[PDB]
Design a protein around this ligand. Sequence first.
Ligand SMILES: OC[C@H]1O[C@H](O[C@H]2[C@H](O)[C@@H](O)[C@@H](O)O[C@@H]2CO)[C@H](O)[C@@H](O)[C@@H]1O
Ligand SMILES: OC[C@H]1O[C@H](O[C@H]2[C@H](O)[C@@H](O)[C@@H](O)O[C@@H]2CO)[C@H](O)[C@@H](O)[C@@H]1O
Ligand SMILES: OC[C@H]1O[C@H](O[C@H]2[C@H](O)[C@@H](O)[C@@H](O)O[C@@H]2CO)[C@H](O)[C@@H](O)[C@@H]1O
Lengths: 656, 656, 656
Amino acid sequence: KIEEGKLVIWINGDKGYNGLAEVGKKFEKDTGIKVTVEHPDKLEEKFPQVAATGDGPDIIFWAHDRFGGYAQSGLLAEITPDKAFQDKLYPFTWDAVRYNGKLIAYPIAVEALSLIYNKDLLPNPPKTWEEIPALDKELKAKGKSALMFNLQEPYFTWPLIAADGGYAFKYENGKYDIKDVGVDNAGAKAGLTFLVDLIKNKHMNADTDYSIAEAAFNKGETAMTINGPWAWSNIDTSKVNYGVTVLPTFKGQPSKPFVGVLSAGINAASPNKELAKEFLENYLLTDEGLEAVNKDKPLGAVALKSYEEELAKDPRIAATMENAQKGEIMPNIPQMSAFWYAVRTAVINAASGRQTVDAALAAAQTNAAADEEDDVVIIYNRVPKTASTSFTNIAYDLCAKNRYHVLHINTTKNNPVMSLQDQVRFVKNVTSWKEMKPGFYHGHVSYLDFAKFGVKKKPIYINVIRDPIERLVSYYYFLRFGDDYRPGLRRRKQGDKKTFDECVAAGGSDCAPEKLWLQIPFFCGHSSECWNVGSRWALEQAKYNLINEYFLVGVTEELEDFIMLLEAALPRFFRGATELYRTGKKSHLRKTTEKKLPTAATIAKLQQSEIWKMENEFYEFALEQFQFVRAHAVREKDGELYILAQNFFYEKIYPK
Amino acid sequence: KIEEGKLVIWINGDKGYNGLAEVGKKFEKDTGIKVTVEHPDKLEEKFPQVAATGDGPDIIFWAHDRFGGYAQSGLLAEITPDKAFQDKLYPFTWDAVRYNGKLIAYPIAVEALSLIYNKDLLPNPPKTWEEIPALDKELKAKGKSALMFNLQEPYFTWPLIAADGGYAFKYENGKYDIKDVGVDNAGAKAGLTFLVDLIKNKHMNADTDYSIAEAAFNKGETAMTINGPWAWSNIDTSKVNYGVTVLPTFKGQPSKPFVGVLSAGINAASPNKELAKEFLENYLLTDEGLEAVNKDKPLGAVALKSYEEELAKDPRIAATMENAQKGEIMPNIPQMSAFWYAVRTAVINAASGRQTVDAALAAAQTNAAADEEDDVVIIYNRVPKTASTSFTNIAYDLCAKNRYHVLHINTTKNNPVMSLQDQVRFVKNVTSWKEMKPGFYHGHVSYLDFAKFGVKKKPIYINVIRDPIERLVSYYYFLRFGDDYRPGLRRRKQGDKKTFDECVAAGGSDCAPEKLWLQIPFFCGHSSECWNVGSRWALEQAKYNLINEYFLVGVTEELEDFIMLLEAALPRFFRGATELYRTGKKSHLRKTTEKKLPTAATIAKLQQSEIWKMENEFYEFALEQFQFVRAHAVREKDGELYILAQNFFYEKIYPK
Amino acid sequence: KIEEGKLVIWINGDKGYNGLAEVGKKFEKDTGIKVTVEHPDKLEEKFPQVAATGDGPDIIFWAHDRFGGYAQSGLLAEITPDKAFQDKLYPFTWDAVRYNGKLIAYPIAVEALSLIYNKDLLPNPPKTWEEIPALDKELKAKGKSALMFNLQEPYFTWPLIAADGGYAFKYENGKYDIKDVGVDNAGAKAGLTFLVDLIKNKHMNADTDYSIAEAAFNKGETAMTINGPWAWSNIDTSKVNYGVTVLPTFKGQPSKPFVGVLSAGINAASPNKELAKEFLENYLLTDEGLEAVNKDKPLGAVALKSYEEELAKDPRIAATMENAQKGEIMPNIPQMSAFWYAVRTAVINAASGRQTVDAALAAAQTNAAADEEDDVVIIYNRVPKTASTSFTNIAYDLCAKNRYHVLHINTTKNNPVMSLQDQVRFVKNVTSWKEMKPGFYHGHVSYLDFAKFGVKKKPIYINVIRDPIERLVSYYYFLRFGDDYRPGLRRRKQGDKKTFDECVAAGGSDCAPEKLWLQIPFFCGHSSECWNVGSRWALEQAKYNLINEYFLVGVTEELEDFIMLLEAALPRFFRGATELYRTGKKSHLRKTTEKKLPTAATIAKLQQSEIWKMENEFYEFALEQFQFVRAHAVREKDGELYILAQNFFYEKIYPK
Ligand SMILES: OC[C@H]1O[C@H](O[C@H]2[C@H](O)[C@@H](O)[C@@H](O)O[C@@H]2CO)[C@H](O)[C@@H](O)[C@@H]1O
Ligand SMILES: OC[C@H]1O[C@H](O[C@H]2[C@H](O)[C@@H](O)[C@@H](O)O[C@@H]2CO)[C@H](O)[C@@H](O)[C@@H]1O
Ligand SMILES: OC[C@H]1O[C@H](O[C@H]2[C@H](O)[C@@H](O)[C@@H](O)O[C@@H]2CO)[C@H](O)[C@@H](O)[C@@H]1O
């Protein structure tokens, strides 16, 4: 409960919160109002929650980039400083805290990342990134490391990714507004690739975080590091002779760090909006106020003109502004949250090798399109003997880390058709079982249309089918020789020497033409007509459902390409699926132990059947559709497939 | 407003809340904090509401089974007892209050239902249920009754339903989790059936509740009763010589009562989470604390080891544990809420005869699939002369009790096609008119696709059609002889002696082939093409809409089977519809007063028309589809149809 | 935070809030509880917001009409007056504050609009509206005006609109409930038309609001005005000799003002529900309480019997009741909110000429069907050279005032097919970009099915196509002579003298039959089959998507009729589009500078192509469908088209 009468302030732990407390103490001694400063973990995430329920701190401190979302969600109150106060702060800092014309926070300081090197180890810091690998080889030979910085927060990695071309909602002006994100273009790739190489050649270590980097550098174990003004305080204490300079260039271009402005917003639910205003305007935003804070951990270029003129003479601050200017001021639009998450995940995954750079960024471009939700559900009504085991298994292996559930649907005697009441039961489970979302449901069930049931959000359908004949042949020898997944269990007809070709020639049951009729009914659905072997109507309904209801249908013999596309369009589920497939062993699961290729004549015989022609028309339809999707989705280079970067943006947006 | 400084506790009225108050008083005398204990009605339902808005009690008392949902909804705060405290309570009781690894409540006591008989009336209590009918005959002859207990709460009935096979999310373990509900299998039916028979043979009375049972037994009017430890307190006061023993077996199997653990959770919005912890750990969960409570109304087997060793010597407690062990500890997963409602409604309806046991449980299986919502809307765009009056009337008769609305859509001159603007008007009404939900809208309107209008949740469509010719013949004589619904009103052509056959032979207007074109356009929709008599495209669109958009389409001559299926798939609307149809009189409403079967030659003539062929193809398509749904939905036994029990469950769920 | 211990009351600023304060002061002197009365702007809108979050005033004052919605949303607490109190207030006033059987507010006074004239200027006030124009001519010649009243609130205009036939949920009774709105019938039109004429003939001024009317009349500048009892207070101060009489009749019928009852409801979140009850029952609803208030600004006919008997002797109050009785008591059902907004917007737009009366009311009927939401999104995937520029431009010009966004979708090289990953990106943007809603997205993109992506709410699709050949011919000469939109930019083939006919005869590329294949794929979508020139399947999918997914598809040569329909079905977007089209100049944008009609023989040649036949079948299908929609949507009169009024309502609603 936001208590009235006192003030609760939240500020990140890397900042000088102890000094901030002193300003709180001064405030108590002059007004009698107690001021408590706290520094929670995941501050930028805790606030929007604890606050969305009329609770939380009175004043929230954070870079301006996230305040936009807080504003759009009505968690921030509008600040009303009179022009007398507004005039003592730099005009461009007020812009950082302006959302929809209103001022939603008080700016405090300008933060920008700089290169921080060890004078004793590296007399002359490197001007470019390209020269850091050679340097590390020399420094390694002396028991040292060249560079070390937080590879966990995209904040520290972004300067490089953006260097040659990456961006996020470039600041534009005009009668109209524009929307264009750019994390999957050449530049961004060239940048992240360079960083991934640095890890491959062991120049850097993928899981080095803020602390390991700080400790390493502050112990003179590594010549350089990348950090903000707040880090100077601890470096001073380590008697390390350091320097704060411009960031290394990449491809002849400067590193463009996303520049942020530390800001203080007032909680819209705060019953002390006034006391909050008094503290921030008459106490914190004064020379003595900022000094108390800055003495704890440097703020950088304060927004307060009177105190900046002083701090500006600090070489380190000059280095800050130099880098700051080489880059850009972060936007404060709501989209920013999705942007950071997308980029955060891409770097981490690219750095650990879980994803290639192409796959990592293609996914981030997708993930940046909206704030990630848990509301998604995938239904994969697998068709027997189509490599469904291999696939469904990729989901099982990725589900724990990717944070989603996998569930197998088991139907009595493996009947593809559920009763009407069971359909209702199934749909109700899938749409309401919140704890299973996001979820991946798979099973031997023909398509079931969720629309008829009045659901809010339909699930996403995907599938995999293979040539009609080959799947049958596969099911044939399967029943007689088992698989290599669970080799122990002898299948129902183990030890029948009758070959497929033999069965055809002798007109056996398991090789009858009507056994080809399977993939069509699985898509056609739970309709009577669907199960009339050879129905033309069912063949049309099958194609319509495949086109209208299915997200993507791949073919057994092209499983890899299928996974690649899914990893681009549905990263929450298949992020890292390609690498897993390409190097996991569990890639070609449940192979049939013994098989015997059909006869050129045995096939030509099956191909005289109406059932075959139909099931074949269907397969072709689906295959053409997959090849089409792949073709409009990727580009080839040296036999390698790459995900085309986003090819659309919004322009002429009105009003602004 | 959850006031800070004091404590508000909620506990059910059957428990010893007065004794709990004494513990509160002790707490006030040692800390100065006032403690108010209250016992509201529908406690388990009030909490989740009053609490979902940051209000309500500080501490909520209830069996552990519902705390799971409270947890998932963030209404409960995590309890932090140190192992010093955790060790003084039985380990299995802490498991009951564990949800998602966290401890969400303090366990207090173990409750289980036992058979409570009158030593003076029934010296030797019956060992099985099967012997209770004979016993009642003997006891009735002496002015007494054999057994009486609450038939309103499924809690008391469940022991019997579960005896031979019923269950709800059986507790399993392994690398994976499982989900399987079982309230519609043989066992559950055999159990509820037995109970329904006991009411049919007047051994028990369907609307006997907790009070009638307690009063009856405590007045020695009935030899037995089923209740929990809390009931002993009032029995002691009635000078009735009673005994607490094992529950009667059914089919050689023991009654498995759902075992619950009385638990105390702390409100997540409570500003006194600490005072709450102090009260529960140092005051209530102590020998003197539980004793104060237990002296008011027995708690059962307390979770506190030190005090259990004492109470355990009580024969009654031994009987409690005996029954407890014969059964199972209730799960605490969110699904539990839906489970209880489904079972509560099935018993009540089966017991009053509103539903047969099959229909009652088939519906509960459906209703257990998700928490009931009011967001559902059914649109029944009735086709003239297809028994729509009979049907729509079943909705009108069931709507009050089943809690939903029925509304008739009236269109100027009964035009099946609404204007584009009216479609928008209609859709807006149906999707936003919250107070009419759930709702049943019916009227002479052709299919209208809600998808095109950007709605969140589409409505559910159902319909009923009949043979093309017979419906026309029906409409023919209708216009001339009226119906028996409103016999007074003479219809537009009353007193035309021209028979149907006569009209055909003379090529009259009302019997023209083009008048057969009606059921097709009604499904095809509001598209121009639909209304071009004899359009092939319209015949295809009709089938597609029937398959893709309609929940279920029955045929006039099979109205009963149609109702049976709807009562299984949509119980909120049609619960009890079968019984109503089978025995209400208002079953064959609006019959046409006088009719004259067409001529074998008059029909053969209509059947030469393209319009007939098409409309006939449609009817056949729909009929085959209904027969198919019915076939995959029911099983026959002695000419009787039964709803197949659920044939699917989830396995290999990962992670756990 | 609704503070406990005091009382916060909200009342509209036109009422006597200062007098109400005096009652608050009396309450403080007898109980020590401070009472603060405030009068915010947009009170009826502020409450439901500030209150929906457990905050706001303790007591809310407003006419009973909106309290229904407040109730349905649980913002009001039930009032519990004992029959001793209930009996001292008129029974019909308690009905006004009864929602769903419960009493949700205390009634205070009955308000009704009356005609207020200047005795000195207009000795004998006009009995009918029809005689006011002549009167103004006489009064204008003397430097005066005849009538002036608030034309901004539909409250003041409604008496006239309802006079001859307009209504809103007429109060009915019976075993069943009824729902029927009537703002687009003859009467309502006849009424608003009369008012619009008064503005056309400059008898009144469209943007005259409450203040201008009050000032004008109170300065004797205008002979009459329409207002409530609250206005008498200021008129008395202006030494104007005024009289309060019956409202002028229209078409021989009396003006039926919507009668409202000023009511005081208690905030459901209020922690002082008792103090609130004490103040309202023992202080405000007493002779001395109402007198204090009434002395500030007359309340009208108080609900308190004892004090009404006094005030009832006031001629002015008699005039109030006379008008009140000629009209009806406003309903208090939730629908009322939507009703007022719809009517408020129609009057304003009709009065400014932005909409004709027909268009204004047709739209209000549509807008009254549900509370307006911002959640709507329109996607207009424009086809090249179909007048899309003219149309998309109407959106741009109307978006600022109509409060919605317009965005152009730009695809690399104008490719109609997005990649699978881009489709995901696009859909994610459109469904989650909250700040762009409502929105209008337009661009060269073929249909994209949002269903496959598991979205909550699909967007609305509209399009415009034209004859296959003429569009091609248009695209032909476009490339060679440019357009008049951006004449400067010379198009890719500027200065080719080859005519269309010439190109055909010489079998050129840009005039090839396969270039006709465009409108079909645009509707068929992102499927491979769609892009196989001449595919029969694609032609069927195109028709299905046009019928199943598109809201409305118009044809280039009938753009006006298309706009008219959209202005009726989607007023939020196209309100005023017709007038803009009919009189804006920017109506036929981007015309091709030079063209040359094809040859009767050149056409007959193209018409031999399979591609033409197909694309032609499609166009015809779409054209027939548009003509059909228009036909069932409008009526013609003197060559003029009018939107048919709503032709459906709900009857036999059960239960009541
Ligand atoms: O990298 C993601 C993260 O970057 C920024 O956070 C910075 C912050 O601005 C600095 O003041 C300092 O605290 O380092 C942080 C990185 O760990 C964005 O401000 C933040 O929104 C974003 O999630
Ligand atoms: O029967 C439905 C109901 O059963 C249980 O409630 C029990 C409770 O556990 C006992 O302590 C005692 O109060 O009798 C109640 C039955 O009236 C479940 O705990 C409850 O959730 C469920 O709705
Ligand atoms: O015209 C729309 C508006 O009308 C009514 O508001 C009246 C109110 O009832 C009177 O007491 C006085 O304040 O004039 C108002 C008109 O400006 C409805 O009560 C209100 O809900 C509606 O929006």
